[PDB]
Amino acid sequence: GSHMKNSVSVDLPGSMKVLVSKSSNADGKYDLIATVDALELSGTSDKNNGSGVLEGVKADASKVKLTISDDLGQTTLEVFKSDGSTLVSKKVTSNGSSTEERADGTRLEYTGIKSDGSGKAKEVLKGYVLEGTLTAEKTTLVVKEGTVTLSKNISKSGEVSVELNDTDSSAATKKTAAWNSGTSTLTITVNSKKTKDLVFTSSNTITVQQYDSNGTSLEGSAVEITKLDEIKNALK
Ligand SMILES: [Mg+2]
């Protein structure tokens, strides 16, 4: 039915919004509501400006907690396991930057974020840092070697896919590659023979394995990459 608006919408960093109540309850508290990646979070605050803590629970039982700083300059979005204390992920966002920290210690860092949503991206992994760009569509981290560019894409849902392009002026030495989304594996081909598989693991590591001289089967064992140089060597 027709009704009084009992909340105001407040703008936060990273195009987030929070609804805060116009008046306080008997405990002196203002009600807060926000929708974050399709989950409605709710909380109460002793401030009237939109700052405070909101909580929600995902379908898989994980606990979500959003902390909005007093001056509205920063937001922290934590996801915990159903125990409410084992941290799965933490994303901290301000005007112009954001950092996502994973359970395994790796981070995605976004800086210089522009009015169109684009910016610089860095993925801090064990042993090395991958850099690239953020757009409103996705994050792309690149490694380059000669005329080859390897591109690791991360979708807005966190899904990883990889692609390779080679501007080599010689057809015979040009690298091409195909991605297998079921195995998160990139297979590189040169001169009509598969040469190596780059496996992007669930542990945020990469492994490399060579094919035999005929391109018909993998040989040896997969080697875990620990250095950026090893990725560049794979692209030679
Ligand atoms: Mg290709």
Domains of the chain by start residue, with CATH: 6-95 (2.40.128.160), 96-236 (3.90.930.1)
Residues ≥6 apart with Cβ < 8 Å to 71: 51
Strand residues in 13-62 grouped as ranges (E) = 16-21, 30-36, 39-45, 52-57
Cβ neighbours for 214, distance < 8 A, ≥ 6 positions apart: 193
Q: How many residues does the chain have?
A: 236
In angstroms, the CA 123 to CA 3 distance is 48
| 178 CA distance to ligand 1 middle (Å) | 6
List the resolution, Å: 1.8
Rounded to the nearest angstrom, the distance between the alpha carbon of 188 and the centre of ligand 1 is 8
d(CA 94, CA 86): 24
Choose among 55, 14, 48: nearest CA to 34.
55
Q: Which of 107, 108, 106 lies closest to 120, judged by CA?
A: 108
- Nearest of 37, 44, 43 to residue 62 by alpha carbon: 37
Please indicate the experimental technique that yielded this structure: X-ray
- A 10 A CB-CB count for 173 gives 13
Residue in 179, 188, 189, 109 with CA at minimum distance from that of residue 141: 109
* Backbone φ, ψ for residue 229 (5° rounding): -50, -35
Separation of alpha carbons 83 and 107, rounded Å: 23
DSSP classification of residue 103: T
- Phi (first) and psi of residue 217, to 5 degrees: -145, 155
Helix (H, G, I), strand (E, B) or coil at 14: helix
Any long-range contacts for 220-229 (C-beta under 8 Å, 24+ apart)? 222/197, 225/127, 226/126, 226/127, 227/127, 227/128, 228/127, 228/128, 228/143
Q: How far is the CA of 120 from the centre of ligand 1 (A)?
A: 25
- For residue 222, how far is its CA from the centre of ligand 1 (angstroms)? 22
Strand partners, 99: 92, 109
Between β-strands 7-12 and 74-80, what pairing exists: parallel, antiparallel or unpaired?
Answer: unpaired
Q: Write out the H or E segment, with its range, that includes residue 232.
A: helix 228-234
19 bridge partner residues: 9, 33
- The answer for residues whose C-beta is within 8 angstroms of residue 60's C-beta and 6 or more apart is none
Q: Quick count: other Cβ atoms within 10 Å of Cβ 130?
A: 19
How far apart are the C-alpha atoms of 190 and 209, rounded to whole Å? 15
According to DSSP, the residues that pair with 223 across neighbouring strands are 208
Tokens standing for residue 186: 């990139």
Distance 177 CA to ligand 1 centre (A): 4
SS3 43: strand
How many other C-beta atoms are found inside a 10 Å radius of the C-beta of residue 1? Answer: 2
User: Cα of 152 to ligand 1 centre, how many Å?
Assistant: 13
Please tell me the distance between residue 234's alpha carbon and the centre of ligand 1 in angstroms.
Answer: 15
Distance 179 CA to ligand 1 centre (A): 9
